[PDB]
């Protein structure tokens, strides 16, 4: 009810990013939605005095028919002042099951500060260029914004205090629009609870971390080999060499002596059977000094593995990996290769969020025109991370496959 | 007199950390000076100006040409960004067809919005005296100047608070704000839309807006950015191409950018040959001549430029279809229609500029360039007729190593068609010789060695002259296509080669890739493994290109 003071960071203008088009249906969507909005007090018309500007688009989220309004804030949040620290929950990462919840609703009920409201302007665009689109600025604290969470801590912290005082086991984390609760119960009584907590945060998605981990690097067994099979065998120890430091391979190379047909099948000497045992003990181990650094930036590298299955890999320096997975979930998106990297980055981003407290930096192996093209129709997330796109295409594909 | 309805004024402040305007006046001629006394006499008369004091430090310089002319650049320097609304133009092709459409412009039409009074000093400007023997006059502006930076904003907002209730309460027509012009359309009789218009005209002259009172000023067809805009249909203004026999780079320029203007509507423009003369530029001066590529391609958009071709206007109710049609040399050329022979516009894309491509690559993004352009103009994504096979596509994107996607589309019939030209298997082809290539070079000679070696017992080494590592890699993997059979297993420690053909493109700009390529394209079967070099697997002979 009391507005808190807000700036921005020192020699930074207020957000001027361009409105990209949009479809006649996410208009209207957007249109209608505004429109309530206006006659709740929660945004306001504003003139051609504002020239500050915020990306708007409309989404569905599961199980839901009814479009939801999303602000792509990045620009804004990157401006916006650095607010101040809660240690990222280390257990959430641990815990058995952890649900989601949207608790974007609360934020409407407190008011934005009336000075920085005029860097919280956006637009919705108009077909065909015939107007300069309807524009808004934000009365109260909106979805997406960095400061929005920030600002409503000491609120969440008075609502959640008896619940945090009843379970103690139960651990409750929040980033942006969301709110991560971690605990070692059964479904039913997990979703009886949630919906316990829904109803305490009322009158104020199931996520199984445990059956996540790191992947290890797997060699073959066969009982025969072939001239291609140890080729490629070779290949991917001298790869993973880069990685773990007693990789050797000169007695699996010294089979390959000779110009043989790559499908002639090569009986495995002794010293090449010890030295592929040694290596396999090699890689069961971890990795050599991998450490976490909340100063650096999360990089994210995702492969397209074909028939609806993808690899990703989560690091900071190279080769240092702090986390690895392939995601193959089908659910709708069997004729579409975009759809299934969306979705694949929601889920790499939510993982992320769920152990580090932020959102890594992607690699696409997606041309930067078609991405941007297609990304929007299939995105359900209240948060947007950054990414890049590579044009080149990895060799060591295979070797994650 | 009746109160005519007031005007809202919009808040404006200068730029964080700068003042208002101070640059001396001009010398002016006496003549110039008396014309400039006599208009802002009557201005002042009209309360468009009011004279102000000595106290105002700010002051702008005005000039004659009679008609006043303040150089606000300066203020314009120093005055605050705005949200400007002209970003992009409307598309004819985008406007939906009216029985009617009516044109009002707007008389008076900045001197009618009042600037807000905590602006209007800086807006400051002095006329001089005759002779200078006294002090000049001071005047500074009540409304929106002509030339300030934020009059169009604010004059269109203005437009647009007076206009809505208007709207609203006539939803059976569609109002149209484009600067100094409203465009009023409708399907209701003629009777009921002049009427409609008489209203409208009644409603903005109770804000004290004025409207031509005779007949409207201009009838169809409408002339509005370089458009003809018709009552059923719509076409680009008279195209202009100059022609003399000695050519500069600014006549390319405008050249190019006339072609690329007509071949909105006009199918069948190409401007690579006219663009590759583009390279090296900023020499506005120069004299390029003309290639034969490029004088048959100028001859041909004379030829196309021949008779006037037309553009239908959007009907909701019908489908959108977007065609494509490859031109080779990286060109491509679209039709957006919704009946058949009737395009509502047309279009070219030309690839993008690199190293390797291929056609299927080039017609995805042909395909992104349409559904980005549609949506921007028509709000939704049109159904396409592209010139590929099911089966082509199916097998591209699934063995792709990027995702990629095209939206609802059908193959059309229409060649060239685009196809895959060749597929690399996906395991070691069983019966097929299996060759061991490798390249080499001397940096510092730039003499080269490459080759391959076989299981068959078949070798190869062949030397090379002016030539590098690389290029030795990519030739020893020619040779082990040239001498091989229809099937073919081939093993090297090129990435840079692997890169190369795991791009799968289908045309290079380098001849030996071309020639590679050419190779694949006749063969049955080829496996492409790869192996780390120096580690001493045997067959992959590093030993034998070194010498
Ligand atoms: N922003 C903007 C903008 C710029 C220029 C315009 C010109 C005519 C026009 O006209 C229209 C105004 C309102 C609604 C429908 C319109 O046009 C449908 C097509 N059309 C055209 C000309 C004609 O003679 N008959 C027609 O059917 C609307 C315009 C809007």
Not at chain 2, 231 to 253: A, R
């Amino acid at each position: 009810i009391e507005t808190v003071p807000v700036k921005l960071k020192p020699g930074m203008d207020g957000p001027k990013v361009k409105q990209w088009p949009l479809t006649e249906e996410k208009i209207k969507a957007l249109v209608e939605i505004c429109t309530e909005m206006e006659k709740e007090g929660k945004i306001s018309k504003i003139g051609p005095e504002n020239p500050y500007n915020t990306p708007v688009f409309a989404i569905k989220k599961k199980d839901s028919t009814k479009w939801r309004k999303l602000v792509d804030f990045r620009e804004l949040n990157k401006r916006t002042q650095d607010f101040w620290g809660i240690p990222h929950p280390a257990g959430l990462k641990k815990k058995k099951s952890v649900t989601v919840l949207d608790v974007g609703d609360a934020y409407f009920s407190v008011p934005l500060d009336e000075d920085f409201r005029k860097y919280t302007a956006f637009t919705i665009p108009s077909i065909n260029n015939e107007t300069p689109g309807i524009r808004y600025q934000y009365n109260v604290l909106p979805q997406g914004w960095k400061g929005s969470p920030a600002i409503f801590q000491s609120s969440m912290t008075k609502i959640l205090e008896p619940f945090k005082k009843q379970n103690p086991d139960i651990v409750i984390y929040q980033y942006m629009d969301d709110l991560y609760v971690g605990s070692d119960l059964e479904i039913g009584q997990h979703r009886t609870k949630i919906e316990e907590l829904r109803q305490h945060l009322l009158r104020w998605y199931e996520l199984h971390p445990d059956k996540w981990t790191v992947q290890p690097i797997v060699l073959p067994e066969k009982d025969s080999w072939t001239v291609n099979d140890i080729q490629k065998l070779v290949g991917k120890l001298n790869w993973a060499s880069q990685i773990y430091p007693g990789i050797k391979v000169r007695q699996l190379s010294k089979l390959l002596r000779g110009t043989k047909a790559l499908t002639e099948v090569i009986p495995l000497t002794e010293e090449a059977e010890l030295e592929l045992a040694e290596n396999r003990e090699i890689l069961k181990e971890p990795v050599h000094g991998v450490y976490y650094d909340p100063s650096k930036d999360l990089i994210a590298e995702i492969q397209k593995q074909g028939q609806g299955q993808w690899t990703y890999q989560i690091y900071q320096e190279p080769f240092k990996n702090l986390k690895t997975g392939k995601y193959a979930r089908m659910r709708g998106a069997h004729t579409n290769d975009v759809k299934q990297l969306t979705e694949a980055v929601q889920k790499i981003t939510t993982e992320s969020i769920v152990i580090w407290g932020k959102t890594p930096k992607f690699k696409l192996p997606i041309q930067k025109e078609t991405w941007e093209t297609w990304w929007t129709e299939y995105w359900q997330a209240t948060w947007i991370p950054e990414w890049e796109f590579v044009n080149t295409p990895p060799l060591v594909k295979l070797w994650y496959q | 007199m009746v109160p005519i309805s007031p005007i809202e004024t919009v808040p404006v402040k200068l730029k964080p950390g700068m003042d208002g305007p101070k640059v001396k006046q001009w010398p002016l001629t006496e003549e110039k000076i008396k014309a400039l006394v006599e208009i802002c006499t009557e201005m002042e008369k009209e309360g468009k100006i009011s004279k102000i004091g000595p106290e105002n430090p700010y002051n702008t310089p005005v000039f004659a040409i009679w008609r006043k002319l303040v150089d606000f650049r300066e203020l314009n320097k120093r005055t605050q960004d705005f949200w400007e609304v002209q970003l992009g133009i409307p598309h004819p092709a985008g406007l939906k067809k009216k029985k009617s459409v009516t044109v009002l412009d707007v008389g008076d039409a900045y001197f009618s919005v009042p600037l807000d009074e905590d602006f209007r000093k800086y807006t400051a400007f002095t006329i001089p005296s005759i002779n200078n023997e006294t002090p000049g006059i001071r005047y500074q502006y009540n409304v929106l100047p002509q030339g300030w930076k934020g009059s169009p904003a604010i004059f269109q907002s203005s437009m647009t608070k007076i206009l809505e209730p208007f709207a609203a309460q006539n939803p059976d027509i569609v109002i149209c704000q484009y600067m100094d012009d409203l465009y009023v359309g409708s399907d209701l009789e003629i009777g009921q839309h002049r009427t409609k218009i008489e209203e409208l005209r009644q409603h903005l002259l109770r804000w004290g807006l004025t409207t031509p009172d005779k007949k409207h000023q201009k009838e169809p067809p409408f002339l509005w950015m370089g458009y003809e805009l018709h009552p059923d249909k719509w076409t680009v203004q008279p195209i202009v191409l100059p022609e003399k026999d000695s050519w500069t780079v600014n006549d390319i320029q405008k050249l190019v950018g006339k072609l690329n203007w007509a071949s909105q509507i006009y199918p069948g423009i190409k401007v690579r040959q006219l663009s590759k003369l583009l390279r090296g530029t900023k020499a506005l001066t120069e004299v390029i001549p003309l290639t034969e590529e490029a004088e048959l391609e100028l001859a041909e958009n004379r030829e196309i430029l021949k008779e006037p071709v037309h553009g239908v206007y959007y009907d909701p109710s019908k489908d959108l279809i977007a065609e494509i049609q490859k031109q080779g040399q990286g060109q491509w050329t679209y039709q957006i229609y919704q009946e058949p022979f009737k395009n509502l516009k047309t279009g070219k894309y030309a690839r993008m500029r690199g190293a390797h491509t291929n056609d299927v690559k080039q017609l995805t993004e042909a395909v992104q360039k349409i559904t980005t352009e549609s949506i921007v103009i028509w709000g939704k994504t049109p159904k396409f007729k592209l010139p590929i096979q099911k089966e082509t596509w199916e097998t591209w994107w699934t063995e792709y190593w990027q995702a990629t996607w095209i939206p609802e589309w059908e193959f059309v019939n229409t060649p060239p068609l685009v196809k895959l030209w060749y597929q690399l298997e996906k395991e070691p082809i069983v019966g097929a010789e299996t060759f061991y290539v490798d390249g080499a070079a001397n940096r510092e000679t730039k003499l080269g060695k490459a080759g391959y070696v076989t299981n068959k017992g078949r070798q190869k080494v062949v030397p090379l002259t002016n030539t590098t590592n690389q290029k030795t890699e990519l030739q020893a993997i020619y040779l082990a296509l040239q001498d091989s059979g229809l099937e073919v297993n081939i093993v090297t420690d090129s990435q840079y080669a692997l890169g190369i053909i795991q791009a799968q493109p289908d045309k290079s700009e380098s001849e030996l890739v071309n020639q590679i390529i050419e190779q694949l394209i006749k063969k049955e079967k080829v496996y492409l493994a790869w192996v780390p070099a120096h580690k001493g697997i045997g067959g992959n002979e590093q030993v034998d290109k070194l010498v």
